[PDB]
Symmetry: C2
Subunit: 56 residues, 2 copies
């Protein structure tokens, strides 16, 4: 089902940006713990995005 493939690929991609929008608001508030996790999420989502692009 490409429907599932599209969700996986489009969401993983969109989460990367969302993660960065958080990382930016975090650094403003100097919220360093939130900042670190947001980076991590950005990095996990990118991995999902790469894995998907390839597999599908």
């Amino acid at each position: 089902g490409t429907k599932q493939e599209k969700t996986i690929l489009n969401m993983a991609r969109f989460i990367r940006s969302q993660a960065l929008t958080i990382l930016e608001k975090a650094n403003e508030l100097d919220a360093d713990e939130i900042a670190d996790i947001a980076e991590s999420i950005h990095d996990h989502a990118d991995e999902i995005y790469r894995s998907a692009l390839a597999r599908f």
Copy 2:
């Protein structure tokens, strides 16, 4: 199957990291970061169900 494990396990982990950020945001009272964290949790859960369906 390497991509599958990655797509599956990371979409699930992100879902957890999204809620961890939601709590810290709530404590610090960061409403914006809090709404986005929710969203990310929700989008990660979608990648998770879709992969679960696609790979299962």
